[PDB]
């Protein structure tokens, strides 16, 4: 069916990151795409991407990025659907430079901020999912089972 | 009407930031409640307030604290809506702890994180009402006339 | 015989920097137990360890977490008894989310904060051991051998 | 009465701070003095305080100090007892020199540190006080007292 | 004359900033202009300004922003003019967002950085001049002059 | 021909990062010069090759250096070019040092700055390539195909 | 009579803290100069004190500098005399730019560093002190009374 | 023949580290001991060598340590001598925590600061060096003769 969350990324490189994004959507059977819109190369795409996308029927958009990272902020500029920031670790500076990027908007155009890293695109896709289940009553009830096993599988003492 | 946003502080100190997000909420007729609730002083209420949100109607709850900010995780650990963080600037590390214990959430159970100070407020009442927006085409008519505003108010110059 | 220190930690992966704290307890003969209690995971079994903890004879609890570390200050939140917070070490930010998470409880509600990692995990430890003795002249006797055995030990040269 | 709780302080300024611990030990009622003592300007007088605290009858060390902070630190490495250590905010780097220089103790000597400021000097007076209440039942009873006040006061919604 | 510079900044706030730089190319005779455009509020007005530049006749864009600060990297990604960046000073983080999300631009599409605030905004001013000084030798002698001027203006001793 | 870009560094180990500054240049065929400088070591031989490099011909200075970074700063003491800094990756403090020791220069005297480490290298040559093509429209139009280049060169979706 | 120290500083504004080595060193009755010197906008200056200090009979020389501050380091390129320095506080980022670009000096030229403002002013004059008094003994028996009055004025407890 | 520079560390794992001072002092031809003292765990040690170093016929102190590093400090309390102070790179930090420990000591009480790691080691014994070369007229003219070689070996352009 149409995808309902697009998941978006810079390069090639941030998908070791992104790809646990995408794996929580498919996981919990929600319906989405997964594409490379760089903000800095490709400019004109992202704009397209961004402004095309409630029509396009997408509900949640997902963006990550590492260092000076402008995807998720320029995407939220260009639409007004709820935009979720995955700050992608940097080399250097770890992602702090990714995560001020991201989390810092200006008042009038947000972001939703999640960790640097895998978590953070794990909690992106979870997020999205919570967002989307206030509407949709079968993935509500995929959800609540889904925190509900996770909360069953946590071990009562450690293995040494 | 019924609130559909709560928004939480953990003390009236935070009150100075928040009260950005309810102003932005009443200016789009969003109807929502304002309370003080504190991880630390006052771990029943939050347990009590976050796992009963859903069933009283809650969509989105939007949360602010500062230093070792527990309330929005706290708070996602005990509900499946989406839960969207703000950190309040702190005296000594200018919200910096406020930040980082925010954001960095496990994989499992997400915040959505907004800017330190009045900017993360006032973003945190606009994300809430663009996932709100989803559903209710009104809603999504008037936060649509919002950003237009924004976007159209930005001036050409400085005045000197 | 029964416990009178509580040792939590999130996870799994935290047992490689919390099981130097278990070490030293069961090196100074003090009895204990120790569990894996997660937050955000698991945030009514926190609650109820933590406030059964003095009615269970429990004395000192430590507790470590990394990144956004909230298991700490939520015990502390729950219990009259001390708390003592070690700082797992984070892939990305190093353990600075985890100490600033920990260290920057608000005042009213105390977590006795140590160092980042082993070393943190290890002075847990002895902190508790330090605090035991105040009441029990055999451990105080103990730990004050432990103190002179780590004064004579230290090299006065190094290899070269 | 003999007190029971050190409070000691590199310098004048730092009472700004320090004071709040001396006050929180005055509201419990826990006998305490309270003292200038500089780890690098009195060294002698560091030295022989923290040998002879156990000997004196103190059961616990509160120690602040701002900038290179040395003086919890290096009073931990003369006595058995615990010593709690409260960062003073330093003019330039905000405590966090100050910060640092208090909680990363090598294994072996602990250091229990408390929040930048004057949250974590009323925090290290509490965690004391929690310490004694475990062979006190009398403070033990005034510190349950104290923080069912502090719960309960948290006001329910803030003012405007 | 045409505009051989442009200023331009996100908001009347950043002026006080910004007003260095344009003060700074009128004592040159720098024909410039200085303008509000803001990446996040009003993108379509950046990609159109950007966009057009040079055929416009502009040489080189300093841009100023702070925070999440994108306005530099997304005008530099749809000109192919050199763009010099200035980061603002933020209220909570000192411009250390403003200089992150600016300085860390990806290989491709470069942002010539300047320091966080007043001197940043001067020296962009300056590297723009000694760009065009390049080949306008009338200006170049001013811009000798300028430098000149203000080596010989250093006192040798300070006053009391 | 001659050299119109000058590429230093402070030593051989620089070259890893500084490499990448060549190869941009030579990629877009503007004739450069690429020598070890030393601040520190040589500082005469800095002052000389920064004083004689307009009158030898250099239009652009490409500077790179790490931890106490001071070759781009005081290169640009001793011209009136153009000077980019690019802060090379430092061991302890992963360019942090680099970063701020470059950046931050007073207003009067300026440093155009990019990223940390190849990022930046990269972009000290692509900026010097389009300050370039201000006056020489051969690689004007060779830069606009560059661009054009990296733009199509985006792919659309990531590879799993 | 003829200087051994020599005071040198960037800018007037950095006598607000520099003032404070050149009042120790008058207490202690040190014979010095006291001067401004900018790396950056005099730099021949710079190169022409610091490698005339020795002949002219300096014996050690402290330099203070804010932001990229690079006066300490370019001096010690110069001389062979012990270069002291001290970070000045800075606007934005509060001296921790001033103190990475003195301290994080290159193997080979060193620079003794001082803490962040007034407090490293004076022990930059304290430190000079205590290197001229190995090979002055009327010097030295000054600064042990200087050192000793410090030790005996340190107040026992808080004035309220 | 008696040593004039004493290096001191506090472990093992420092000599990694401070062997770099160790080797340039032989080089230099400077009579030196090389010990370990660590302010923690012997605190008394530290004293006794601190307070007798100067009538030991010492003249300068290198001391080394990390994390927490209070031993460059505890020792210039008890001596008059110049204290020279190494950060050692820690673990979590990367020796951020072991720099600001070291180099924010109050007005006072100085230690001349070099950079993390070997180059500060290095800087240590260099420092060290142009203090006695002020008395010490063939050392003086070796160290000259070391400066020299140092400038002379730098090569003009990089391997490729
Ligand atoms: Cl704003
Ligand atoms: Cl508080
Ligand atoms: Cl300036
Ligand atoms: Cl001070």
Redesign the interface.
């Known amino acids: 069916s149409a995808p309902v969350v697009g998941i978006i990324?810079?390069?090639?490189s941030?998908?070791e990151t992104?790809?646990?994004a995408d794996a929580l959507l498919t996981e919990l059977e929600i319906p989405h795409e997964?594409?490379?819109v760089?903000?800095?190369?490709?400019?004109?795409?992202l704009?397209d991407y961004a402004r095309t996308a409630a029509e396009r029927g997408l509900?949640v958009i997902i963006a990550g990025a590492g260092?000076?990272?402008?995807l998720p902020?320029?995407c939220?500029?260009?639409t007004?659907?709820?935009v979720?920031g995955v700050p992608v670790?940097?080399?250097?500076?770890?992602?702090?430079?990714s995560?001020?990027?991201?989390?810092?908007?200006?008042?009038?155009?947000?972001?939703?901020?999640?960790?640097?890293?895998?978590?953070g695109a794990?909690?992106?896709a979870?997020?999205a999912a919570?967002?989307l289940?206030?509407?949709n009553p079968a993935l509500?009830a995929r959800?609540?089972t889904w925190?509900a096993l996770?909360?069953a599988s946590?071990?009562?003492?450690?293995?040494?």
């Open positions: 990324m810079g390069s090639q941030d998908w992104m790809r646990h997964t594409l490379i760089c903000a800095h190369r490709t400019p004109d795409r704009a509900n260092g000076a990272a402008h902020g320029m939220a500029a260009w007004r659907l709820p979720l670790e940097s080399r250097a500076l770890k992602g702090m430079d995560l001020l990027s991201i989390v810092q908007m200006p008042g009038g155009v947000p972001v939703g901020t999640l960790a640097i890293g895998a978590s794990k909690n992106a979870l997020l919570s967002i289940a206030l509407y509500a959800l609540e925190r996770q909360t946590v071990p009562n003492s450690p293995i040494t």
